[PDB]
Amino acid sequence: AAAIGIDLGTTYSCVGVFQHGKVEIIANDQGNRTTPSYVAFTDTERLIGDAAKNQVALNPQNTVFDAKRLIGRKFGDPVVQSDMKHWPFQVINDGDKPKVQVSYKGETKAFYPEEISSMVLTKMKEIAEAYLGYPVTNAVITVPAYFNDSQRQATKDAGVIAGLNVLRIINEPTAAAIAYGLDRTGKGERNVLIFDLGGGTFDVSILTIDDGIFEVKATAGDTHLGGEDFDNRLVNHFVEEFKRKHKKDISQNKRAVRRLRTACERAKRTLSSSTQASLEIDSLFEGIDFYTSITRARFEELCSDLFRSTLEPVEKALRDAKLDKAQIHDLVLVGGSTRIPKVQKLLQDFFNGRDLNKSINPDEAVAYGAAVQAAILMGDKSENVQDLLLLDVAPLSLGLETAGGVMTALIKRNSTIPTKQTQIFTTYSDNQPGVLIQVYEGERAMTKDNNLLGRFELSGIPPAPRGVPQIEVTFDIDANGILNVTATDKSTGKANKITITNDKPTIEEVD
Amino acid sequence: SIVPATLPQLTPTLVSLLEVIEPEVLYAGYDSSVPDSTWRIMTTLNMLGGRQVIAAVKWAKAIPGFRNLHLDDQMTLLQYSWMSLMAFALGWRSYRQSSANLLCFAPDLIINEQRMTLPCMYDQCKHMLYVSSELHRLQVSYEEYLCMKTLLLLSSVPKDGLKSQELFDEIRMTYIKELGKAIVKREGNSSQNWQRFYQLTKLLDSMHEVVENLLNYCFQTFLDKTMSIEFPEMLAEIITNQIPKYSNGNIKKLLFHQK
Amino acid sequence: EVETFAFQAEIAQLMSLIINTFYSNKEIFLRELISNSSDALDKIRYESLTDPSKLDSGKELHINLIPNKQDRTLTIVDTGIGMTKADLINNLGTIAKSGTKAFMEALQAGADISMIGQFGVGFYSAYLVAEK
Amino acid sequence: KPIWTRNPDDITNEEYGEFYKSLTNDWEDHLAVKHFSVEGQLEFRALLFVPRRAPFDLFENRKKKNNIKLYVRRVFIMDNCEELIPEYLNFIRGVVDSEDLPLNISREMLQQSKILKVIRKNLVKKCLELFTELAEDKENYKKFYEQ
Numbered sequence A: 001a002a003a004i005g006i007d008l009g010t011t012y013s014c015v016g017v018f019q020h021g022k023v024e025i026i027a028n029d030q031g032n033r034t035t036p037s038y039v040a041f042t043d044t045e046r047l048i049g050d051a052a053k054n055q056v057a058l059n060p061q062n063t064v065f066d067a068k069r070l071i072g073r074k075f076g077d078p079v080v081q082s083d084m085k086h087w088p089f090q091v092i093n094d095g096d097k098p099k100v101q102v103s104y105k106g107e108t109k110a111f112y113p114e115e116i117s118s119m120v121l122t123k124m125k126e127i128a129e130a131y132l133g134y135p136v137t138n139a140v141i142t143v144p145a146y147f148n149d150s151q152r153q154a155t156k157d158a159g160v161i162a163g164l165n166v167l168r169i170i171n172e173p174t175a176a177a178i179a180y181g182l183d184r185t186g187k188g189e190r191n192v193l194i195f196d197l198g199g200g201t202f203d204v205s206i207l208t209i210d211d212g213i214f215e216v217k218a219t220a221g222d223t224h225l226g227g228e229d230f231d232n233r234l235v236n237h238f239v240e241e242f243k244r245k246h247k248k249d250i251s252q253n254k255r256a257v258r259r260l261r262t263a264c265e266r267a268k269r270t271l272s273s274s275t276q277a278s279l280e281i282d283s284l285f286e287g288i289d290f291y292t293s294i295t296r297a298r299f300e301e302l303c304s305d306l307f308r309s310t311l312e313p314v315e316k317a318l319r320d321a322k323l324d325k326a327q328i329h330d331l332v333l334v335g336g337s338t339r340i341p342k343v344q345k346l347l348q349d350f351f352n353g354r355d356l357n358k359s360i361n362p363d364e365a366v367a368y369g370a371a372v373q374a375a376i377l378m379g380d381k382s383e384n385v386q387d388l389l390l391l392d393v394a395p396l397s398l399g400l401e402t403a404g405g406v407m408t409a410l411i412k413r414n415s416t417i418p419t420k421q422t423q424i425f426t427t428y429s430d431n432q433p434g435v436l437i438q439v440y441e442g443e444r445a446m447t448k449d450n451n452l453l454g455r456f457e458l459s460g461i462p463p464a465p466r467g468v469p470q471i472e473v474t475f476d477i478d479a480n481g482i483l484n485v486t487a488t489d490k491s492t493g494k495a496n497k498i499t500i501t502n503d504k505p506t507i508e509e510v511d
Numbered sequence B: 001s002i003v004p005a006t007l008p009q010l011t012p013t014l015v016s017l018l019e020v021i022e023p024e025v026l027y028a029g030y031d032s033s034v035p036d037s038t039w040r041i042m043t044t045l046n047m048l049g050g051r052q053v054i055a056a057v058k059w060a061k062a063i064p065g066f067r068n069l070h071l072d073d074q075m076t077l078l079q080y081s082w083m084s085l086m087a088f089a090l091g092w093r094s095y096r097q098s099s100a101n102l103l104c105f106a107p108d109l110i111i112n113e114q115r116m117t118l119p120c121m122y123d124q125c126k127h128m129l130y131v132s133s134e135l136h137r138l139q140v141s142y143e144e145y146l147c148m149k150t151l152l153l154l155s156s157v158p159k160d161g162l163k164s165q166e167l168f169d170e171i172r173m174t175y176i177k178e179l180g181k182a183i184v185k186r187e188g189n190s191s192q193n194w195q196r197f198y199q200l201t202k203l204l205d206s207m208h209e210v211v212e213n214l215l216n217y218c219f220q221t222f223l224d225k226t227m228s229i230e231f232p233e234m235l236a237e238i239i240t241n242q243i244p245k246y247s248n249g250n251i252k253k254l255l256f257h258q259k
Numbered sequence C: 001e002v003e004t005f006a007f008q009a010e011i012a013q014l015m016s017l018i019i020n021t022f023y024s025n026k027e028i029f030l031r032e033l034i035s036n037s038s039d040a041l042d043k044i045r046y047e048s049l050t051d052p053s054k055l056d057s058g059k060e061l062h063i064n065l066i067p068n069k070q071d072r073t074l075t076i077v078d079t080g081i082g083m084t085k086a087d088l089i090n091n092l093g094t095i096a097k098s099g100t101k102a103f104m105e106a107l108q109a110g111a112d113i114s115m116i117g118q119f120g121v122g123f124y125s126a127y128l129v130a131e132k
Numbered sequence D: 001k002p003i004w005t006r007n008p009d010d011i012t013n014e015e016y017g018e019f020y021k022s023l024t025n026d027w028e029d030h031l032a033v034k035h036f037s038v039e040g041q042l043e044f045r046a047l048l049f050v051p052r053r054a055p056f057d058l059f060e061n062r063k064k065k066n067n068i069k070l071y072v073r074r075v076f077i078m079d080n081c082e083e084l085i086p087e088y089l090n091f092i093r094g095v096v097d098s099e100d101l102p103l104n105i106s107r108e109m110l111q112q113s114k115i116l117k118v119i120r121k122n123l124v125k126k127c128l129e130l131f132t133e134l135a136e137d138k139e140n141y142k143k144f145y146e147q
């Protein structure tokens, strides 16, 4: 039972566990891997996840969600003031630490945002535990890259309230890069652009990865751009339509609008795989059955500026990172809203047709990375490296035929693998343009008595007297015994290779 | 293209020898200075004092922790202490070369009696002779002498203190403890340790009486053109900065013993 | 009435080592006591997140240092959770035997006294300079 | 808050300057500072300062190993942070705070650890980037170069 990582968002969250080289992303009670960052305080119990989201229209005044905007902030913080004007619940200046007042079991208790998010984390904890069949406290929680230190501590504390051992707080874009394997090494010295288009926010972050070591070069964003306003444009389409079609002003009924919005969310998600989606609500407003539709093209028109504006922070991030388009090697998507074809088309066209990394569901990639990181942090073994080195060795020395018909070993018998070993060779005779390397396995001095594994030619060698050209021959062996023998001439940079397949007295006298 | 080979068969492994190679020969002795005159030391003492205070700066910096003092204070201390360091330096050489009867401006220059008693010499030099006489009467060892020269270095400060004074104070107290040790391990017995210590310390304290008069000569000849006295750039800067503070009582004399 | 208790052997030995072993880094004295006060302050702060009443006795969570040279004393005040009679008796609230034993083994292996807090027995370092 | 745990964009040059003076016991200001952070497989933050001066002792008397302070998860470990940077760079004064280093510190643990190997590798490339930034605006590069 491995450590887990939790993707703690403003509108949604997701938990995964890392094991057997992969992260298993875990479904909630209804089969949903990603569930809402909502807690509904009712007079009987607090519902968490889909259960809270499903009743926002009925109990919005007591349902608390998007705790993150308030977490780690002071009551007087302009952000706090900006968001409290948008909530159905009351935000309270309890010592400049904004609390939310909702009725729980009949009492108008003020709940601090860290406990609201711990309620969410506790639910995510329970989801992963039910799946894994084991209680789990070892965890990584992700946060936006822009979070400051009061916010990071606040996130750790929400974890502690929930009973978690917070191994670490890591950034959302780091986790995505991890999820896509950009930290597996051999992919170093690359720039990664992460496009984080979520529910209530949009962020862009440019990372540089050097063989597993990360640096963040730049960030940019729009703190109010995300799926929620794509939903609001779809809502205005349907709300104004309803009113005009029926001469009934639905916009004034918070529940009817929320039912319409829920349909907007469903239709929009459907629309992203489709070309068309519909709205079908019985008795939506004043007993009126509202049946209508949205096409993909209409959706894009409604939201045409919301989509185009996502590239403005892209240009900003590139400016801050001092990078041109050509300097981004890896294009990465984060957030369910990037599943809309228009987003993919805009980012991909912006970067001249280059393919986006869509290999992991955008809403799972962050949790995925957190889970991988949680597993290494709980104890630093992650399908490597010491077992590979101690269990698998080169069973026979590995080397090459050299002049004289003899074998020169570069990898010694029973040496641990994976490993890379080298030696310097020159052409045997004078003024040759290249060399012939015969790769062998075995313990005999002569090559005629060894196992020929394969042969290759190293070209690009300036002719010079014997012993002058400097050729480095490398025996590069992986964990499974596969051998790659390469060679290069250090004076020209030219190289070639062969792939070898796997087997698996006087002093006592006087005068 | 030809089969490769481990050529030339001349690839050395000198690694164990490279580990062995470490030593080099290092040398002592870094600079040198002398006066070029005798009765005219009335002006050449300043050229010498310039070179000696500069040497005193190099010397002072060589003492661990001195370079960590604020530069403004490092220079303030040589600006005020150069005079006692000079008289004391003459003192040691005089003590050993002329039985403290003559001042020894450099290892290669001793000014004899026929010049020593001339007013252009003696009005300043009689105070420097006091110092030589005391090292001789006191029978000061070279270790004890160096401890005292080192103490004089930090002995004259502004009445308002030093910018980085706390480090100066730690250094100066380390030095007085060193003088005590130099004496205790040489005289033997107990009564002779305190008598040699306090008698040598009294010279360090009386060096300020020597400095008051030696500086007044320099201050007077620096400002009064009637005297026809030339100064090097080093002392000229020190003296213009030192006169308005020393003659007005704005500089504190630090003593290591009471009367 | 004053109750007298024995120290558990692992810590009776630890305190002997602290006093008699010639450790030069006496400054860890203050470092460890301040650090331990921080832990106590967090214990309340975390409980106050689900049970705010823990702060009803005093909302301020802080560390005070108050020397009084005339009595050869220093007071360190931890406004954190504190200890009940039972915790004071039970090794000032820690797992003294497992922590200290592992630490003594670490010391036998060459560990410095500065590592005492890494075993959760950091407060015994008070005796580096304390008589009492 | 520790200056190195603060956000480099918010910290002013005056703040870095006074910090530096206190860090180094240098009344003169810093020439340049590189403030950066690293995440992923190894988390740390660091401040590397190039002093305005190279005042002699650096080549003879200074215990240069004490130029950079080491912290682990903000816990001070030591001043003599031998092998954080190669000798040629021992003129840089600074602070390195490594979140992922163990506190069970001895020279042997550090020397044989891949963490120290990585910290040194990365502190060095960052130093070189700072020098490159100084190379631009040659009017100031030469001030550096001269010493």
Ligand SMILES: Nc1ncnc2c1ncn2[C@@H]1O[C@H](COP(=O)(O)OP(=O)(O)O)[C@@H](O)[C@H]1O
Residues within 6 Å of the ligand: A008, A009, A010, A011, A012, A013, A034, A197, A198, A199, A200, A201, A226, A227, A228, A265, A268, A269, A270, A272, A273, A334, A335, A336, A337, A338, A339, A340, A363
């Ligand atoms: N196929 C889709 N098309 C359009 N929007 C989607 C799709 N799938 C998910 N979404 C939206 O993505 C959002 C999920 O955001 P996520 O990145 O998980 O959370 P957060 O923004 O809180 O970090 C929701 O607002 C949801 O409606």
